[PDB]
Write a protein that binds this DNA or RNA. Structure first.
Lengths: 129, 286, 65, 266, 188, 169
RNA sequence: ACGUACGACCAUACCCAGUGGAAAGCACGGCAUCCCGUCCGCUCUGCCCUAGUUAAGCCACUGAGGGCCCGGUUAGUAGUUGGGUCGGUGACGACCAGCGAAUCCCGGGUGUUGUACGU
RNA sequence: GUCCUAAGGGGGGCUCAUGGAGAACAGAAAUCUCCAGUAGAACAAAAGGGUAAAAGUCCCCUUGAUUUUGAUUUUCAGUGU
């Protein structure tokens, strides 16, 4: 049974621009990911109400954050026509950014974990182009 | 003239015993326990936070007519079961002790045949309510960075609804009315003590060894404190009632009764007192 | 318009409800969707008339926020 | 009143449409037994929040002269009093005094049985929280007299003692203690005061099964001397004022469910 | 175990005071044994508590809020004496009687505000009190004075206290009228 | 039990007082000379009652003082008794175990004369305590110091003679 | 039984002094980077619990002088109300009752107790 | 005749009058230190039991000088938002 939330747990600042996306980790509620208009994404430890990592490198507003279904990656899509993959347990970018879109990348979708083949994951990115 | 005469002694009115001992602010206690905004005849709980030289005492207390009652109690020396062996009075240990008391309260209530009138009269559109308590700091000064608010922060993170504001947490800036959650996280995971460890290790090695002689002896580095406190928080949230045995001598209650009565000095009886009075009278006569 | 709060020239003009420039009026702000800190719905606020309705045929106001 | 604090005190002591909860003053005479002092301690423990306590010896016999009691009511703004006394004729006496407009409305004597008295500390149970109101049960045929007598007076006085603060709502967790006063009509009847804590159990139905456990104190009283109110003062005291939130009903004028004023034509 | 008891005469209730009245007699055993005596008294107490709990849980409306599960109680119905007499209208003062006879209406709260707009300085100022307009010019660096009033002025007194003198005289007159009204009301 | 290390006599504080009696430039000069002597800002004291004979008024700053603790108090007391030639009276020592004296010229301490600030004298007062003085000073569980722990006039005279190698007449 | 934390009665607990304290806990203590506050890290606040020490606090016992608290006595007595009921012109005396003191004196005592965690 | 970012409210810290022993001028009476001090000071009222980690006294914040709403109470309304 899930009981109704009734009171504020933590109000955590740190973003300099409005928050455009938020999503919990599939493992537990302890890890939360937000992406904002300050060209950054952020990880939050929700147990103590504290920041954990600040993912930097986009040059446009981070329009979308999406955890991998197993929870080992975080994919962020931004207004700078790029998608990046980060390691949420270390806050480091995995390899280089994903380039090829011509306009803003608006949405992301991971392939379901039971459909992963060839020893890799697949990510779909929808753009304005 | 003598100010302390018979009239003064007869006219003297003593304070309360705990006021004479200097342990209770009854002016604050009256407003803590006998004041309520609503008159729904509901019980009220307080989180009593006290500090010694070597321990932190946190209790969940209700007030009855013949004395207070303890719902749950957590002590900072019980952190040894969860791996914290040093700094048992620092701000991070205060946070962990408040978290432990919150987890113990929730475990005792089952929020982690006899039953309640709430369950008797529960309606269809009813939700689980949080456990609520008000902070009791005693005679401590409520300044920014105090460990009473670390205990309160740990309890609120553990899941007790405690009404509070954020302007007394470490890292708060009064000129901008903004809280620095980086400094708050540093204090929660003990980064101030670690930063002092590198500061002493670079400036004064002798002072570093003298203050942290147990830290090097147990081989606890400054960089491991964050992982140690995080693992302690996870262990506390996993098993709130882990049993901890101390290194003090262990006997049964009756054995301790015998051991204390071995050293207790007995009060003299009337016959012995009269014998001593007669001996004093004989010595005065001689 | 909910009420005329203060006509700057005369309390008699306020009583008569005269809508001139600089007049403080009460307006219904239900459509603006204003929610207070306690979660209540604020549906009445104050605005100031910024035009001359006798010359324009319309009342223009700015919310005092 | 110069200061705002003294002005606040005078405004709090001023008469109101909705009266404040009554305050009880606990005081004793020149001589007073230890059992009587224990009984006063138990009653003060039951009524801590709205009571004031004297600690000296007062040369007062209430049924001869009550000018000092009126002066104490004036000074302390206390409308109920528990007065302790001891004597050869009356060894353990609790005098309940109820005031009106800082003058003695009525008084009643209780004689306490010393052999059957048990204090709150003699029962090893969980006690009532400070400030929480208990519920009240009055049992027996002595409280249904058609003429006003000492037992009806004692029922009214004990109700006024254990009222606490009135409230339109109460939490279901505030129904854990009950004060029971038992007295039957008839050689002198015994008014028995008991306090119980309430436990609830499953019964297979919606309503819970109530079981009681004794909380203390255990008091046995014989009703003694009685000073009845003057009829005019009693009428003025039993007058009931109406709050502004009680609308005076007008003929053919009503309020609808949206708050519109509605008139009816015939 | 049953949650309902049967007695020859039904209980009466006052749920505002949480009061239950049992008019049935308490057949106390005519023995001297304390255990069975308190057992009988506890049985009476259990019966009363049971019917009170049943009455509260059945005939009061129940609201589940964030505070908890609350029962809405009726106002108390037991007749109980007040501690102080019911408030009465004050005796009518001289101004109140004169205004009632002459049809003088009370000033509105906006009309009686301690605020006015000074044109010459172009600022808002108080009519009375601290830095009020009734003491205008007492801190003015330059004050012209007429020669006749300066000659008629007593020695030692200055023009800078004339407004304070006038204010003190008006206050003394107002307080004298207030004390006369209070004395007449005390006689009434 | 007198050989316990927790009964060791030590200086609690040293208070330096200049009672000028008149407000203004003289009081500012006294505060300034106290500032160079101590190393910290001083405290202005206001008159409690008004005295026409002394020419003082209530709530008027007439005096200045500095409280100094630590080895700074020891070195300032060393300077003062160097000026006093390590000779004190039995008249100076109190029954509570504190002592003090007074000098007339602050130049004799070793401060170079500045004609802008002038010449002042001072009252030096030294308080003596044993460890355990937190008991009567802490906010929580404040209590009374026991009788055996209190410092006597003979004990502080013996301490002064042994520590400063001084003479008491 | 002892210690600690919140307490309940609020001097049987207070004012003064001496003696002792196993265990652990309190406590004195050590250091001023960070949080924080002072004229003064005295107080408050942070860090250390390692090292010294029961010297003081605290606890227990004892001792004087006061004070305080019980029970009896005073005593159903003074005194106060009742022509109450009998005289006394009435006042007032006794008697009958109802309420109802205190001083003095005697004896005893100088803290009990709840919850929780420990020794 | 002078002076004031007014009074008030909240929160926090401190303990007063006085006496004894002490400190250059300083001497009954200036200031500072310790000890003792049931309030014997101050603020209110007219206690026969007001207030002591405060209701006293100093800091911090507000000073916005009389808010809004009401189908409800009372009175009034030829100008009945």
């Amino acid at each position: 049974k899930v009981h109704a939330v009734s009171r504020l747990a933590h109000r955590i600042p740190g973003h300099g621009q409005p928050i455009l996306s938020c999503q919990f980790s599939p493992v537990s509620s302890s890890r939360l990911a937000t992406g904002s208009g300050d060209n950054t994404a952020r990880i939050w430890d929700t147990d103590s109400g504290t920041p954990k990592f600040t993912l930097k490198g986009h040059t446009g507003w981070v329009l979308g954050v999406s955890w991998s279904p197993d929870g080992k990656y975080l994919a962020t899509c931004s207004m700078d026509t790029t998608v990046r993959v980060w390691d949420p347990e270390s806050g480091k970018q995995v390899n280089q950014e994903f380039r090829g879109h011509a306009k803003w990348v608006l949405a992301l979708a991971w392939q379901p974990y039971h459909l992963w083949r060839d020893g890799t994951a697949r990510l779909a990115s929808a753009s304005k182009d | 003239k003598l100010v302390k005469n018979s009239a003064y002694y007869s006219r003297f009115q003593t304070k309360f015993k705990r006021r004479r001992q200097g342990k209770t602010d009854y002016y604050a206690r009256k407003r803590l326990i006998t004041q309520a905004k609503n008159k729904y005849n509901a019980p009220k709980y307080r989180l009593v936070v006290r500090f010694t030289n070597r321990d932190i005492i946190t209790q969940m207390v209700t007030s009855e007519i013949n004395g207070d009652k303890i719902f749950a109690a957590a002590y900072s020396h019980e952190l040894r079961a969860y791996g914290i062996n040093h700094g048992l009075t620092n701000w991070a240990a205060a946070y962990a002790t408040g978290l432990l008391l919150a987890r113990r309260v929730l475990a005792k209530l089952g929020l982690d045949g006899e039953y309640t009138l709430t369950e008797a009269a529960e309606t269809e559109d009813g939700e689980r309510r949080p456990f609520k308590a008000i902070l009791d700091v005693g005679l401590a000064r409520t300044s920014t960075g105090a460990r009473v608010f670390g205990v309160m922060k740990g309890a609120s993170d553990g899941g007790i609804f405690i009404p509070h504001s954020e302007n007394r947490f470490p890292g708060y800036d009064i000129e901008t009315e903004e809280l620095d959650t980086e400094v708050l996280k540093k204090y929660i995971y003990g980064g101030h003590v670690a930063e002092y460890m590198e500061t002493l290790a670079d400036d004064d090695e002798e002072r570093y060894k003298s203050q942290f002689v147990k830290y090097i002896e147990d081989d606890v580095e400054a960089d491991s404190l964050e992982e140690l406190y995080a693992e302690a928080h996870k262990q506390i949230r996993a098993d709130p009632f882990r049993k901890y045995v101390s290194d003090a001598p262990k006997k049964s209650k009756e054995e301790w009764k015998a051991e204390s009565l071995k050293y207790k000095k007995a009060k003299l009886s009337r016959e012995e007192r009269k014998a001593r009075v007669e001996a004093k009278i004989k010595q005065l006569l001689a | 318009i909910l009420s005329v709060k203060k006509n700057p020239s005369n309390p008699l003009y306020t009583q008569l409800g005269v809508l001139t420039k600089g007049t403080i009026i009460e307006v219904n702000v239900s459509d603006l969707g204003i929610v207070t800190a306690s979660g209540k719905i604020a549906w009445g606020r104050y605005a100031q008339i910024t035009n001359n309705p006798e010359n324009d045929g319309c009342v223009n106001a700015v919310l005092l926020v | 009143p110069r200061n705002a604090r003294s002005k606040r005190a005078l405004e709090k002591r001023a008469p109101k449409i909705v009266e404040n909860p009554k305050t009880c003053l606990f005081l004793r005479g020149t001589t007073c037994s230890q059992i009587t002092q224990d009984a006063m301690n138990d009653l003060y423990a039951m009524r801590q929040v709205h009571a004031k306590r004297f600690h000296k010896k007062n040369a007062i016999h209430p049924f001869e002269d009550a000018t000092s009691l009126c002066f104490f009511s004036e000074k302390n703004d206390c409308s109920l009093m528990v007065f302790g006394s001891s004597n050869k004729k009356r060894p353990h006496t609790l005098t309940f005094v109820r005031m009106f407009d800082y003058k003695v409305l009525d008084m009643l004597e209780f004689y306490l049985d010393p052999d059957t008295y048990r204090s709150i500390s003699q029962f090893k149970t969980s006690k009532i929280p400070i400030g929480m109101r208990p519920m009240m049960v009055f049992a027996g045929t002595a409280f249904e007299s058609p003429v006003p007598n000492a037992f009806t007076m004692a029922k009214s006085m004990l109700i006024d003692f254990f009222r606490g603060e009135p409230s339109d709502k109460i939490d279901v967790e505030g129904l854990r203690f009950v004060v029971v006063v038992t007295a039957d009509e008839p050689q002198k009847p015994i008014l028995r005061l008991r306090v119980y804590g309430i436990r609830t159990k499953r019964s297979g139905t919606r309503l819970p099964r109530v079981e009681v456990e004794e909380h203390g104190p255990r008091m046995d009283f014989r009703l003694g001397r009685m000073r009845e109110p003057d009829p005019a003062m009693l009428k003025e005291a039993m007058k009931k004022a109406k709050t502004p939130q009680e609308e005076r009903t007008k003929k053919n004028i009503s309020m609808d469910l949206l708050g519109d004023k509605i008139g009816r034509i015939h | 175990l049953p949650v309902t008891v049967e007695k020859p005469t039904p209980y009466t209730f006052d749920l505002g005071l949480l009061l239950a009245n049992d008019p049935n007699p308490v057949n106390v055993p005519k023995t001297t044994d304390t255990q069975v005596l308190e057992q009988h008294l506890a049985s009476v107490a259990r019966d009363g508590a049971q019917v009170l709990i049943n009455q509260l849980l059945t005939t009061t409306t129940i609201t589940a809020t964030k505070d908890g599960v609350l029962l809405t109680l009726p106002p108390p119905t037991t007749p109980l004496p007040r501690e102080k007499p019911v408030p009465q209208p004050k005796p009518e003062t001289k101004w109140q009687a004169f205004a009632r006879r002459r049809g003088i209406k009370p000033k509105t709260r906006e009309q009686r505000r301690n605020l006015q707009y000074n044109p010459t300085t172009g600022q808002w100022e108080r009519k009375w009190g601290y830095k009020g307009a009734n003491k205008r010019g007492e801190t003015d660096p330059i004050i012209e004075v007429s020669a006749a009033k300066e000659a008629m002025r007593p020695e030692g007194t200055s023009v800078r206290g004339d407004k304070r003198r006038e204010i003190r005289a008006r206050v003394k007159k107002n307080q004298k009228q207030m004390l006369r009204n209070q004395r007449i009301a005390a006689e009434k | 039990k007198a050989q316990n290390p927790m009964r060791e006599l030590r200086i609690q504080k040293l208070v330096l007082n200049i009672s000028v009696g008149e407000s203004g430039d003289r009081l500012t000069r006294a505060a300034k000379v106290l500032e160079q002597l101590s190393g910290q800002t001083p405290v202005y004291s206001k008159a409690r009652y008004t005295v026409r004979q002394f020419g003082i008024r209530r709530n008027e700053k007439i005096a200045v003082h500095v409280t100094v603790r630590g080895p700074k108090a020891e070195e300032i007391l060393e300077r003062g008794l160097k000026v006093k030639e390590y000779e004190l009276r039995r008249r100076n020592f109190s029954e509570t175990g504190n002592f003090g004296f007074g000098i007339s010229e602050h130049i004799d301490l070793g401060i170079k004369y500045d004609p802008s600030i002038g010449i002042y004298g001072m009252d030096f007062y030294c308080c003596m305590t044993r460890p355990g003085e937190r008991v009567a000073k802490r906010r929580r569980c404040k209590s009374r110091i026991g009788a055996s722990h209190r410092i006597t006039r003979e004990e502080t005279i013996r301490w002064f003679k042994q520590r400063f190698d001084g003479i008491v007449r």
